């Protein structure tokens, strides 16, 4: 069950990383804040790939 959890672990890290980027680039002039979006993935049915 590491495969499902590890993928979710990386997704949380990426979401946290982008937040840090949006919070560090504050007071920059020509900057637009960015956010990340996720999407699930199933091989067939009843099986989850994270």
């Amino acid at each position: 069950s590491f495969s499902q959890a590890v993928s979710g672990l990386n997704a949380a890290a990426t979401n946290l990383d982008v937040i840090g980027n949006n919070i560090a680039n504050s007071a920059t002039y020509g900057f637009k804040s960015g956010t990340a979006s996720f999407a699930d993935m199933f091989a067939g049915s009843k099986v989850g790939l994270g």
Partner: protein
């Protein structure tokens, strides 16, 4: 002495190599310009007791044969030449390379090595040398009574003396790339040398033909993430324990066989 025992020994060896790679990656988590390495395996041959797809009768064919594996062999341990992060070291003689490319250097015997490090110093004679005593191949020298050394976005590097109210150009920091950066074999003290797997090096100014750019006053940190290393340690430990238990089961089975 038995097939299961040999298969389990090969599995244990593979897991030991994986653990060693993980430990080596974690050890130099702070080395500047370090590129991590990843281990890749592939299973060994198969003994075919019954040929798959064999002609069992005049018209019937076996949908599947009988094959027994022989184990797993570690095929390679490859560097991952990703892009490391950059930091603010604030040194006039510190350079970071963004993109791809290598700084050339001359070994004492005479051949050429390639590096990704940026901590450039000056020898006693005023030649730009790296940490370790090696000097860059294009032989850039820094004259005495130098106020400031400025390295542009491209390869041009200039120095300012006390007077003359204008910078004077010293040399060009051309950098070399390879067709296959992964094939370069690493050696000690953070260096790489050309092999047959990688193509012949091509030298160019920064910013052209896909080469990177030079940033002065920065330094490139290693491309190792501590987050996933720990979970890899957990998984490899569990796999190693499983293989050891398989060895134990084989030994117990054999002992109960020979107890007769």
């Amino acid at each position: 002495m038995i097939s299961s025992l040999w298969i389990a020994k090969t599995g244990l060896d593979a897991q030991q190599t994986n653990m060693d790679v993980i430990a080596n990656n974690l050890a130099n988590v702070s080395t500047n310009g370090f590129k991590r390495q990843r281990a890749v395996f592939e299973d060994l041959l198969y003994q075919t007791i019954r040929q798959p797809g064999a002609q069992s009768s005049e018209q019937t064919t076996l949908p599947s044969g009988l094959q027994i594996g022989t184990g797993v062999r570690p095929v390679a341990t490859e560097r991952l030449h990703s892009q490391g992060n950059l930091s603010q070291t604030n040194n006039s003689k510190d350079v970071a390379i963004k993109g791809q490319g290598f700084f050339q250097v001359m070994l004492p015997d005479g051949t050429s090595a390639y590096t990704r490090d940026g901590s450039f110093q000056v020898d006693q004679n005023g030649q730009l040398v790296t940490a370790g005593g090696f000097q860059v191949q294009p032989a850039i020298t820094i004259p005495a009574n130098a106020l400031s050394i400025t390295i542009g976005r491209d390869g041009v590097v200039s120095v300012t003396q006390q007077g003359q109210a204008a910078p004077v150009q010293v040399g060009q920091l051309n950098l070399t790339t390879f067709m296959n950066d992964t094939g370069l074999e690493s050696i000690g003290e953070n260096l790489y040398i050309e092999t047959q797997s990688s193509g012949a090096p091509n030298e160019s100014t920064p910013g052209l033909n896909g080469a990177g750019l030079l940033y002065q006053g920065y330094v490139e940190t290693s491309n190792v993430n501590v987050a996933e290393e720990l979970v890899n340690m957990i998984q490899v430990q569990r796999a190693y324990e499983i293989n050891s238990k398989a060895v134990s089961t084989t030994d117990q089975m054999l002992q109960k066989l020979t107890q007769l």
